[PDB]
Design a binder for this molecule. Structure first.
Ligand code: NAD
Ligand code: NAD
Ligand code: NAD
Ligand code: NAD
Ligand code: CAC
Ligand code: CAC
Ligand code: CAC
Ligand code: CAC
Ligand code: CAC
Ligand code: ZN
Ligand code: ZN
Ligand code: ZN
Ligand code: ZN
Ligand code: ZN
Ligand code: ZN
Ligand code: ZN
Ligand code: ZN
Ligand code: ZN
Ligand code: ZN
Ligand code: ZN
Ligand code: ZN
Ligand code: ZN
Ligand code: ZN
Ligand code: ZN
Ligand code: ZN
Ligand code: ZN
Ligand code: ZN
Ligand code: ZN
Lengths: 373, 373, 373, 373
């Protein structure tokens, strides 16, 4: 059996910054106390993983990226009580220890164990991956571009057995982030007028969230007009582009709504568009939510008056969800046909084609690409 | 009688920026349509007024400042229905026309008639003051450093007749802003921890707000340790100065609280402290309210990452109050003994002694100085 | 695009009388010769619309009511020449073909195309709505509680582009009616004494008309004493309720004015108040204008002596205004700030909250609720 | 002389209703303060006088009716200043005290002193006639079927000495009623189309009034076709009878005029025809003037929708004339040859033949019958 043993399996390893993937043969250490070794069934390609490759996301090397996936528990560590071998699960980059301040607080979800600094190691401070002697790091409490991974129990979400791995894997990041961004972070209201910068997989998910929140007008923004057809079909009552006019996108949006934009979402990852989305919500009651991760070590410079007048500016992590709580529920909600993830998955390919996946994403020819094992 | 006629009286004029007050004899034209001419009984000296003098706040010159006051209606203009002569009123710098989007919005308050650009005129675009054959500008729909002033009806609140004008005048800016900032803009929850950057008149008011909201810890921060005694008398659990330690204030606060700073309030007017306040609240579930008025034409550069983690950053105008509905309620609550304003008034001087009032404000030797007529 | 195509949208339908609204998916056929398809931006809730529900206003079922609205022309049918796609417009329940007698007569305004018999169809006799494969009838040449509607060109007024939809929609009925009822129909002369029975949306507008005309005393009447505050503000000099005294309201009015009630307006819709309003004007030189709609199939029995003595009794449709001529002019006058429409609008809600709009009217809590799309 | 002495003379008296006159010897008391005793030269027989006999008009018994006449002032009471003995006058059944609201109001004419209640007394509340000991009552402030009568100075119009008393007496009721009904109450416009219900003495005068107003069409209506030739002679353009067709008269008239009946006058006295007259004027811009006196204590039931659509419905007392100002002018205009009264007088008989006059009226063999002394 594999339990207790070291599992030799393949994994898409990254040896250094700005280098292509390399599918090595690696060895996954068995789960120590309160850890869980998971066999990955399908993992999607989130734009964040690409950040590490680009170097806009802090990370130690070598590292096995990937964090959006579904899998089965191959073996539980000592002291594990939330899952047993055979259970279907979803690895949580955003954990839920249920013990820290942010966890004990209904309005907080950024668990203390959240890898926000590029630690690239588990709770005890070590790695569980080896490749050619040298140890390979973790990515955001997960690492899913591997046949097997080992995560802390606090980052394991037991989900329903009948859940399609290649679909619900979007609940591990992309979908839950955009949806929760509207529903739980900005808390969009019925009849509201929202704006969505960036029509990628998370962008399209925010639109879905707003629409499910009763927003009557949802304007989608993107440079890539090819994304519009998807946007309009997701819930966008309209879609425009910064380049369609020479006047500030803020002014345009104002004029379009007669100065009544109650919500704006930045779902790209640019600082320039963070100022844009802020400037675009109403100067006194408008709320601007930042979903896109800003590039590492970049300082923002804007006009504070835009905030003084009353605007609310907040950031978002995993759509404001409390991972271990909300994730299994969101899976149940999918099974009950409540939301369609299929609209998001533009490509389903075998793990080996990972390089193609990062070619597609980077060309705008795809929303979500699910790598299957 | 004086109704219908031009009134000749004394007003503290500011002929140009970076110049002292000049108490001239000016002419106050009678109230046109839906305008109200008020006899000023008591007016407080607010830091925002000093900004006009210092030159860090936009204004046309000459101009009559003052915007925190209690008065009596001398005469109403044609069409006025909410007040009649002899009525006790508080002129409002933040109007409430009850008809615009912000006014109609239950989460708004920055009425479209607000003089947010330093126009220095009333709704019809004209001034009611003249001195030496020259038209003197109005200040934020009010101008109270004058025996009489004329405001629009949307900028007048009828208050209880029994209200001590030399106390409830703070309800026209200082107290309402601070107290509102905590109870309304911030929505401080009971049992939480708050940090107030700035212990002047507004700062101390925010403490009263947090205290009214049930917060278990309210930490005051000021470089002037002479402010601490007062801060403690009005509810602060403890006070400290940034100069007390070399490590970042945000680190000190986090440590002092076990990483649990629920809310912070910038009640000073420095971009640097705005960022310190932002950073000092819990990265994921913390809220930071910008009460202080940023100096004219200065951009703010801060680390975006501070936001992304989930922090909520929001502006604050007049405590988030809908002026015409809330000011009378605060007066009613003052008369209901729900809070004391005496703790905020450290000096009560004749109007002619305004320059001494400004000296004490600047020298840190006074919270609120109230000028009487 | 949508031109020449069947639009699919949502509309609040009434399947039978004495039933709640049921927002359904409906199809709206493209405009035929001389018709115009309009996208609705905002629409008011008029008491007449509620009559259909109550069964006291004739209509064929199912039907889409709503008539007080502002919109933008989605497209124009063959032969149209007064509006073009993009034009902002107010749909007119009161046509103005300009050919018929009432149209050619400077004192007339009820065009032959006016729907006074519950025809619920367009000029060619057919419908443009379908729901579940079945025709749905129009209402008063308009039908605005739908995202899209088609009207005959005779029933559209091209208004100024800067006109705020959620405000100028009141010019499609409520305001123009009660305003003109005083200025145009009753031709209230300066110095007179007017009396308004009913202080709702239309009743308040009547008062503005009387005030505008020059009446010296405008007396408002309403069983709902909560409506007094606004009547007073709008122009009333005093208000009273039928209940305040046991003596017939006419006696009360005679005694208050010393038998000098020049004009009376019935802005309710009860036969009893129609008579009450009649008996209330001076028996020999008094004029009584009926603005309220009398319930269908109800005969009015009165004392002919009230009339014989010299009293003038006259009906009033849309305040006696000629639709396509006067609507564009009232919009322009609004933009010139001649009359205040926002005083009438107490609630702005999103279209989906229609039931709430009616319940508010029916509970006596609103004047006008504007539903926005 | 007779001045100051009780005058014994004859008069036609009704001892009770539904009883023919009885020429008796009566005593006419001298004129008290501000009264005038008049010698009746000529008096006309108006249908209203017959209402008293039939019982459909309210009056006390016994009584001396008649109210249409010309006479000469025998003696004036104390304080009289408008007329002197020998002066030719016309007694006014409709007074003009010049001090009540109606009298002072330019649009009023029903003076406060009018006997609208059936009192049959003078201003001071007493009678002046006596017969067989018992006092007989006055009628409509006049009483003219007597050789002598006493009216109040307010009910006395001094006319031109050169006026044919047997012709100008029509200016005491009939002519003035119908003529003014068109020109003053109805304000008939040039080129309009009028319809006159009732081709009797008052109707023919309305027709003369419509003809002077410049009407284009004047359609007369009567059950008695023998009345047509005269109607055509005074100005009618055509005449018809309700029985000429089975379809409602309103439809007939509409078809005849192409739905353009601007004015309708009811000069008969039936509630049914008052309604028929209403429904016969254009539903929106039509005006219906009620001239015929409705039978006492009879309620009128109609369809309020006839009024609602815009019809103006109004009463008429003495064709809208302010008796003391207008009667003298009508006489002067008569002597200016403006109109011809001869056409209205079909018979001139001596006072003793009163019964014949009433026989001819009730049989349709006479228009106006004048009784001479
Ligand atoms: N906060 C989190 O919890 C969280 C979770 C998931 C993803 N993310 C972050 O969200 C962002 C996007 O997520 P994604 O997976 O949907 O990426 P994505 O690439 O699919 O979306 C990028 C979209 O933005 C559009 N875009 C790029 N530049 C633009 C510009 N200048 N103006 C308008 N549109 C522009 C692109 O055309 C594309 O449609 C990334 O920063 C990712 O790291 C954050
Ligand atoms: N939002 C608004 O509606 C509104 C309303 C009223 C006042 N204000 C603004 O609020 C701010 C305060 O008003 P105030 O009347 O209470 O002024 P104040 O002069 O009484 O208070 C300033 C306080 O901050 C302290 N301070 C100054 N620099 C500091 C620093 N670097 N670190 C810590 N403490 C420092 C001062 O010692 C003083 O105690 C000003 O910006 C004023 O313009 C805004
Ligand atoms: N003539 C038309 O062209 C035209 C146009 C618009 C509306 N209307 C009709 O006008 C009438 C009122 O319109 P609205 O929109 O202003 O409705 P509304 O409901 O807002 O106003 C009705 C008002 O009358 C008051 N009222 C009701 N019963 C009363 C009574 N028994 N005695 C005294 N006051 C009483 C109500 O409390 C309310 O204040 C309705 O009949 C409507 O159908 C007619
Ligand atoms: N308003 C006043 O100031 C005033 C003044 C004078 C007369 N009146 C009233 O005017 C009315 C007419 O007076 P008149 O003196 O001319 O009397 P009248 O008898 O001469 O005229 C009555 C006419 O109506 C016709 N008529 C009756 N029933 C008919 C019907 N159903 N349809 C059509 N025609 C019919 C008769 O044939 C006759 O031609 C009476 O009611 C009288 O009391 C009122
Ligand atoms: C079937 As049915 C009552 O709508 O005619
Ligand atoms: C007129 As039906 C659709 O109710 O039968
Ligand atoms: C035609 As039916 C009375 O069923 O609505
Ligand atoms: C004759 As017509 C068209 O005005 O009814
Ligand atoms: C006598 As004629 C006016 O009908 O021609
Ligand atoms: Zn991701
Ligand atoms: Zn935790
Ligand atoms: Zn980009
Ligand atoms: Zn201030
Ligand atoms: Zn406002
Ligand atoms: Zn100036
Ligand atoms: Zn400072
Ligand atoms: Zn001191
Ligand atoms: Zn039916
Ligand atoms: Zn209406
Ligand atoms: Zn039908
Ligand atoms: Zn027409
Ligand atoms: Zn009612
Ligand atoms: Zn207004
Ligand atoms: Zn008569
Ligand atoms: Zn009089
Ligand atoms: Zn008697
Ligand atoms: Zn008859
Ligand atoms: Zn005979």
């Amino acid at each position: 059996g594999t339990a207790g043993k070291v599992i030799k399996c393949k994994a898409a390893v990254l040896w250094e910054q700005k280098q292509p993937f390399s599918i090595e043969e690696i060895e996954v250490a068995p789960p120590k106390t309160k850890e869980v070794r998971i066999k990955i069934l399908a993992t999607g390609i989130c734009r964040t993983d690409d950040h590490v490759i680009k170097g806009t996301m802090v990370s130690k090397f070598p590292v096995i990226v990937g964090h959006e996936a579904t899998g089965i528990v191959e073996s539980i560590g000592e002291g594990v009580t939330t899952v047993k071998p055979g259970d279907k699960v979803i690895p949580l980059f955003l954990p839920q220890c249920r013990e820290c301040n942010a966890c004990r607080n209904p309005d907080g979800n950024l668990c203390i164990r959240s890898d926000i600094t590029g630690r690239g190691v588990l709770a005890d401070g070590t790695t569980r991956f080896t490749c050619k002697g040298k140890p390979v790091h973790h990515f955001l409490n997960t690492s899913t571009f591997t046949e097997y991974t080992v995560v802390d129990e606090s980052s394991v979400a037991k989900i329903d057995d009948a859940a399609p791995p290649e679909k619900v894997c979007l609940i591990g990041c992309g979908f839950s982030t955009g949806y929760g961004a509207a529903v739980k972070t900005g808390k969009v209201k019925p009849g509201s007028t929202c704006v969505v910068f960036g029509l990628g997989g998370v962008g399209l998910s925010v639109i879905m969230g707003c629409k499910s929140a009763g927003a009557s007008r949802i304007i989608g923004i993107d440079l890539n007009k090819d994304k519009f057809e998807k946007a309009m079909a997701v819930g966008a009552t309209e879609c425009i582009s910064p380049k369609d006019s020479t006047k500030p996108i803020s002014e345009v949006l104002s004029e379009m709504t007669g100065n009544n934009v109650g919500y704006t979402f930045e779902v790209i990852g640019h600082l320039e568009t963070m100022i844009d989305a802020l400037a675009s919500c109403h100067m006194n009651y408008g709320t601007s939510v930042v979903v896109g991760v800003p590039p590492s070590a970049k300082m923002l410079t804007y006009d504070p008056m835009l905030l003084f007048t009353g605007r609310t500016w907040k950031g978002c992590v995993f759509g404001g969800l409390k991972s271990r709580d909300d994730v299994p529920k969101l899976v149940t909600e999918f099974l009950a046909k409540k939301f369609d993830l299929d609209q998001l998955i533009t490509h389903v390919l075998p793990f080996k084609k990972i390089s193609e996946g990062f070619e597609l994403l980077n060309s705008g020819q795809s929303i979500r690409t699910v790598l299957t094992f």
